[PDB]
Design a protein around this ligand. Structure first.
Ligand SMILES: [K+]
Ligand SMILES: [K+]
Ligand SMILES: [K+]
Ligand SMILES: [Mg+2]
Ligand SMILES: [Mg+2]
Ligand SMILES: [Mg+2]
Ligand SMILES: [Mg+2]
Ligand SMILES: [Mg+2]
Ligand SMILES: [Mg+2]
Ligand SMILES: [Mg+2]
Ligand SMILES: [Mg+2]
Ligand SMILES: [Mg+2]
Ligand SMILES: [Mg+2]
Ligand SMILES: [Mg+2]
Ligand SMILES: [Mg+2]
Ligand SMILES: [Mg+2]
Ligand SMILES: [Mg+2]
Lengths: 162, 272, 294, 312, 43
RNA sequence: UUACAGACUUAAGCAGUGGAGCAUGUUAUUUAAUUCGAUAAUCCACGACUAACCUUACCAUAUUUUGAAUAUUAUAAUAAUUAAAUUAUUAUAUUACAGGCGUUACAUUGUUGUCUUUAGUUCGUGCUGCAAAGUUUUAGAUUAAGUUCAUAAACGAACAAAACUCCAUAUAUAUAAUUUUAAUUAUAUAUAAUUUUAUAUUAUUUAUUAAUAUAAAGAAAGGAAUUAAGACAAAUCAUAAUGAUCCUUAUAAUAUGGGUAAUAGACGUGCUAUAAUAAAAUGAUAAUAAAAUUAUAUAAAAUAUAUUUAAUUAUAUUUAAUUAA
């Protein structure tokens, strides 16, 4: 008998598994951004594997439009504004959506993937919580205070006198 | 034990290399707060054979330091082997970066093989909130590992027809919402980032919702039934987007021209 | 495939069995795994990931981006050695390359002997043991170019076994004089020639040879006479195995042309007694040698 | 293949010394500014002295600042020539040399480790991983700094004939073509070993309807038979052999003079004979080439050392 | 760098940039090209 | 100094420059100052991707003197350490200094402008000449062109390169529960061409060939990056950095105001216009884009005034949504 390779090890060599969406209740939107795609894609694949074992139906990574920033410089330090060099930066974006999951399990996903994050990858998470119209116990500016103080000071009260 | 390096009295009886490892840990962890200890020196003298260092030198090295060793050496002039020939025993720094990449991959592979499966113990069945008792949706935002001002922003969105308002009260609700109501989609959406914490902003939107609902359900003085709904704000938004509202004419469809599935005996025979 | 705990417990460590059991209860046996052609998560080889490789995995206790220990629980307190030595044999020596362990033990004579054996078939042992090399001319020459004066090293050497075989070699190098001598030593061995010697000590009679502007007058000498000739000729005679010789150089005394002229004279201007006898059909007797014969 | 494997290409993230993305652009600018300042500070912590006549200069490369969501790892390569106790004895096992003392304050010191100080400057967990390089010509940055700062007495009155000779016998002149062709043969062999494994696993049959949709070929072991960590990894690793190096000098060493030393290969043939494709780092530097410049000040003034290494 | 001499008393760090400046100051003093003594406000 | 080739030029074509007004840079002159460069090609909307203050480097007046740094030595205030002394921090003081857009790009680092040529250079071996050297056919053929090919006592190797490549384009797979919708899309991976094929003709070094046409197949038609050497001791010490030399109650530092916006002539570069193949109004189920931007914000709709039914334009009031497919 050869050495048995269990399903957990085999899964690592194949595309991440996805759980079917039953109801379609969008619970979270995780957008990942990086200046390079390679770590972004690898990390996105890891998130899908983490969610599967947690029981979270996940979709994506959906590629969002890449943003391009551009800067044009003059190569010479002092004069010669006729030769200009071009520079650019590309923001790569990916969207992973979570469905039909309880808030506690969703927080476990975010905690785990935060602990094992990759270099140069940023993450924004929009959480969607469906609530009742009427809740129990619910869910002054600095400038204004100074104005009141100033209008009580003698340099201002001396005029307001009617 | 973790604290063993702090108890040189307990080092007696440990193997030679373990004592040296505990001697090196006490120096690294204490640094400028390191003071020679007799027990520590006694244990190190027991390793004079594992290292073949004269028992006398150990004592000097233990009290003098690098200077002591330089004296034992007899000089401080060691050949400058900075351009020595390559012995094909180390990798270039650029190849060591590709090995680091592979060390990271294997680290993640190992987590996915043996650590992620353990997360299945925490699976919880989805306790779906009834779509009718929970019509309001609060969107929260979190920028992980960052301080971002927008993290405070909270958004509230609900379908006006799911608020349980009568016909006249529903009309008053939509009139008072003004630009916050989209008749096309029937969505009433209001966001607030005025406060510093999202919890504060969530309550603020909740309180406004209760106030708007109370006013809309109090039709004792005015019901605003004469006032028609104003959609000018929605029209302006629609003009800024492109509308592909054209479909293929149904009377142009020719279903009789579609390809007809052919008979394949092999597939028909392979199924039996 | 799903395996019973018994089988899996005989190959994988106990600490990893719980993960395998949970994975075999969450992934249905009828899962049709698909291959990803965008992202390569797994390595290009098979690995159970049950053992930490000392090189291909992060070193336990070393700080790094994915280190799981707390910052106060690292176990690397010595920094004088490379933490992760190369795997396997411990080297990456390319196939067909040798570690330069010894340098300076290389001998220019042995480098000439190896190269010449591969290029011409001459025996390395003879070159490295039987031959003696003596530089004769070592100077710097220059060529005037548009970029500027390009200097070159010129070396003229003589090699011989002191037993009749002698050769002259020339070499040029723009880098260093040692390279010019190596090329000259290489050239000299290829030009090795045998020279007739009377009684293996001197030449047959007298030679008056003209090589370009050099007039060479060489006279044979009695046993024990020694070499009384131009210094350039002296060195060649030493390598060739000539012990007794007299002579004078007239007109041009250019060292380079004296050496070449001498070698040419020793071959083209000599005739053995045996060759003279056979051509003329006569017996030639060495009176001095017969006087001391039985 | 080359860009789809972590062992055959350099991740583009490594082309930048600060590897970060923050939604808050201001915080990203601040982190970038903090990384330059800490890099300068670390350069000032590399020169150590035991006694007036024992000054040990550690040559440090530029820092690689890996900013993840939860922590910052500051990775740098360093070279140290141990000249105080370079013996065959084990006396170094009973005291901490100055370089070990310096490396132990990065993370090990329990009271004043540099990581905790930096953790407050960055407001995140910080780790420092020093990596020791045993030769000075394995990193272009370290090589330039050594020459610029330590070999001045060799090129301040022209490049010594011995100094240049040492800089030309550092590496044996490997034949780049056979090494390039050996690498391509190994790839073909590995590629042909997996195709044969599947062809056999299919011809041996490891629902006819399901035999037209699924692509699962069979057991992982059979598909990857004879492809293990002991033969695949080390044969596909790239940039493993130094095949070329050029060291330039310039400045005043009363007029500036420039001397250029060029020795070896400045190209890669793995990209010509095979479908593997080259990548440009920062979109202008070839990947095989690593170039760095280091300047210093002498009696006359500023002089620059420009080193370029070609690793294939 | 000035805080390193108290954070890590055991280690002796050398500031090459500062050291270079001090050497240039001594050199100019020896050539007579030093800096004039600064006038005191009391005067 | 010869011949050939190459571009360089010229031609043709479209719209301009040179003329008017204005904008802008420069010169000259003026001024307490009108800061300083750059200033033929290779300066002149250049440095400068914004001079009211600031910026600022200039001028007038007033004011500061170890100054922003490091170290030394004192003095204190403070916290720890150690049995009141020590050490930490902070402030003050002390003196070496700090500081300098002061001079020197013709003393420098780095960067850049301008040009040339790359089958370019070196290395190894072989061969020719006594040798310095040469490496020979060849002043080859061919292409728009290293374009492609052939050849010689030369044969290789290395770089220089070309290319490989990345981009665009075409197609395939994957991803999106097609309400973040643009699926007519987004972005990862891979494929594709340096096109191929036959046919007749015309030349040839006629052969296993070129130039053409012709039919056939194909989405296939464009770009990029970087350097090899050398010259102008070309620009920059005003992006920052270095030596020398000079200032140190001032050539350093701060504040208020002024100047850099002056105006005879001259020059560069732009804008607007001199009317009918062309200008002006109006066009609401709203003809038709792309690429960017919005936490040191982008600002909807509405209302009010100019202002007239309304629209349009400008501003105010108010501040919806979005920190974003
Ligand atoms: K030659
Ligand atoms: K002004
Ligand atoms: K008109
Ligand atoms: Mg709002
Ligand atoms: Mg509008
Ligand atoms: Mg829009
Ligand atoms: Mg001012
Ligand atoms: Mg001003
Ligand atoms: Mg100074
Ligand atoms: Mg000034
Ligand atoms: Mg000038
Ligand atoms: Mg000859
Ligand atoms: Mg659509
Ligand atoms: Mg101006
Ligand atoms: Mg008009
Ligand atoms: Mg429209
Ligand atoms: Mg409006």
């Amino acid at each position: 008998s050869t050495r048995p390779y269990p399903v957990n090890v085999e899964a690592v060599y194949y595309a991440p598994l996805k759980l079917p969406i039953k109801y379609g209740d969008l619970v979270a939107d995780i957008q990942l951004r990086s200046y390079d795609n390679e770590n972004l894609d690898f990390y996105s694949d890891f998130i899908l594997r983490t969610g599967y074992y947690l029981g979270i139906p996940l979709t994506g990574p959906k590629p969002l439009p890449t943003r391009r920033e551009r800067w044009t410089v003059i190569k010479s330090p002092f004069v010669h504004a006729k030769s200009k060099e071009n520079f650019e930066r590309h923001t790569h974006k990916r969207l992973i959506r979570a469905w039909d999951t309880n808030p506690e399990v969703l927080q476990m996903l975010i905690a785990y993937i935060t602990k094992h994050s990759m270099a140069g990858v940023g993450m924004k998470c929009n959480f969607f919580q469906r609530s009742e119209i009427s809740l129990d116990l619910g869910s002054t500016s600095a400038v204004g205070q100074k104005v009141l103080e100033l209008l009580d000071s003698p340099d201002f009260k001396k005029h307001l006198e009617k | 034990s973790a604290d063993l390096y702090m108890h040189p009295e307990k080092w007696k009886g440990l193997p030679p290399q373990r004592i040296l490892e505990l001697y090196w840990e006490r120096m690294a962890r204490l640094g400028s707060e390191y003071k020679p200890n007799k027990d520590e020196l006694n244990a190190l003298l027991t390793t004079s054979e594992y290292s073949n260092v004269p028992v006398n030198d150990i004592k000097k090295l233990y009290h003098r330091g690098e200077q002591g060793a330089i004296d034992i050496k007899g000089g401080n002039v060691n050949r400058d082997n900075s351009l020595r020939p390559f012995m094909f025993d180390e990798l270039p720094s650029q190849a060591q970066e590709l090995v680091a990449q592979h060390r990271e991959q294997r680290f993640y592979n190992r987590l996915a093989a043996y650590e992620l499966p353990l997360l299945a113990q925490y699976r919880q069945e989805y306790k779906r909130p009834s779509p009718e008792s929970h019509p309001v949706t609060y969107r929260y935002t979190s920028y992980v590992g960052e301080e971002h001002p927008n993290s405070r922003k909270v958004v509230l969105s609900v379908k006006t027809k799911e608020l349980g308002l009568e016909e006249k009260s529903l009309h008053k609700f939509r009139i008072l919402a003004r630009s916050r109501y989209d008749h096309t989609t029937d969505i009433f959406k209001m966001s607030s980032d005025k406060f510093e914490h999202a919890s504060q902003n969530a309550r603020y939107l909740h309180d406004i919702l209760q106030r708007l609902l109370a006013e809309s359900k109090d039709l004792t003085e005015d019901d605003f039934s004469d006032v028609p709904l104003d959609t000018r704000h929605t029209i302006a938004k629609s003009l800024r987007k492109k509308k592909r509202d054209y479909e293929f004419p149904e009377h142009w469809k020719r279903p009789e021209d579609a390809p007809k599935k052919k008979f394949d005996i092999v597939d028909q025979l392979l199924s039996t | 495939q799903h395996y019973d705990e018994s089988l899996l417990s005989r190959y994988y460590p106990e600490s990893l069995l719980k993960s395998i059991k949970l994975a075999q209860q969450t992934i249905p046996e009828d899962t049709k795994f698909r291959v990803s052609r965008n992202v390569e998560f797994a390595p290009p080889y098979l690995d159970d990931f049950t053992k930490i490789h000392p090189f291909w995995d992060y070193k336990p206790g070393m700080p790094h981006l994915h280190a799981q220990e707390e910052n106060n629980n690292f176990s690397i307190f010595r920094w004088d050695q490379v933490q992760q030595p190369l795997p396997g044999e411990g080297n990456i020596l390319p196939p067909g390359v040798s570690l330069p362990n010894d340098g300076g033990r290389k001998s220019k004579s042995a480098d000439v002997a190896a190269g010449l054996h591969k290029q011409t078939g001459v025996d390395p042992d003879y070159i490295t043991r039987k031959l003696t090399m003596k530089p004769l001319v070592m100077k710097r020459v220059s060529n005037q170019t548009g970029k500027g004066k390009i200097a070159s090293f010129y070396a003229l050497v003589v090699v011989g076994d002191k037993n009749g075989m002698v050769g002259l070699g020339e070499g040029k190098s723009r880098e260093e004089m040692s390279k010019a001598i190596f090329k000259a030593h290489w050239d000299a061995v290829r030009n090795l020639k045998e020279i007739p010697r009377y009684e293996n000590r001197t030449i047959y009679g007298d030679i008056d040879f003209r090589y370009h502007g050099v007039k060479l007058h060489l006279r044979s000498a009695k046993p024990g006479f020694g070499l009384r000739v131009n210094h350039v000729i002296f060195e060649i005679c030493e390598c060739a195995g000539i012990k007794d010789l007299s002579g004078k150089v007239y007109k041009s005394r250019n060292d380079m042309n004296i050496a070449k002229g001498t070698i040419e004279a020793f071959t083209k201007a000599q005739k053995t007694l045996d060759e003279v006898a056979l051509g003329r059909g006569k017996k030639l007797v060495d009176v001095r040698k017969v006087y001391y014969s039985s | 293949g080359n860009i789809n494997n972590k062992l055959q290409h350099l991740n583009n993230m490594n082309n930048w010394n600060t590897q970060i993305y923050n939604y808050n652009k201001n915080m990203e600018i601040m982190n970038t500014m903090n990384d330059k300042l800490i890099n300068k500070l670390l350069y000032k912590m590399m020169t150590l002295k035991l006694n007036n006549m024992n000054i040990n200069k550690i040559i440090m490369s530029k820092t690689i600042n890996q900013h993840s969501l939860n922590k910052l790892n500051i990775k740098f390569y360093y070279y140290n020539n141990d000249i105080n106790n370079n013996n065959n004895n084990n006396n170094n096992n009973y005291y901490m040399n100055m370089m070990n003392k310096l490396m132990n304050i990065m993370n090990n010191n329990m009271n004043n480790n540099l990581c905790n100080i930096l953790s407050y400057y960055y407001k995140k967990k910080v780790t420092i991983e020093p990596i020791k390089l045993s030769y000075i010509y394995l990193n272009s940055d370290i090589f330039s700094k050594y020459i610029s700062l330590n070999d001045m007495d060799k090129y301040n009155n022209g490049i010594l004939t011995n100094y240049q000779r040492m800089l030309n016998n550092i590496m044996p002149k490997l034949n780049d073509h056979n090494i390039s062709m050996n690498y391509i043969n190994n790839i073909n062999n590995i590629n042909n070993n997996k195709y044969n494994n599947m062809i056999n696993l299919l011809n041996n049959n490891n629902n006819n309807y399901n035999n037209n949709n699924n692509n699962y070929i069979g057991n992982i072991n059979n598909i990857y038979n004879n492809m293990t960590i002991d033969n695949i990894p080390m044969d596909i690793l790239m940039y493993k052999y130094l095949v070329g190096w050029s060291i330039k000098f310039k400045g005043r060493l009363g007029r500036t003079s420039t001397t250029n030393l060029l020795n070896g290969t400045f190209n890669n043939k793995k990209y010509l004979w095979s479908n593997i494709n080259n990548n440009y780092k920062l979109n202008y530097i070839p990947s095989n080439h690593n170039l760095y410049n280091n300047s210093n000040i002498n009696k006359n003034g500023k002089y620059n050392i420009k080193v370029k290494l070609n690793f294939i | 760098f000035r805080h390193l001499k108290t954070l890590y008393p055991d280690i002796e760090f050398v500031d090459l940039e500062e050291q270079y400046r001090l050497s240039m100051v001594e050199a100019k003093k020896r050539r007579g090209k030093g800096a004039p003594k600064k006038m005191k406000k009391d005067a």
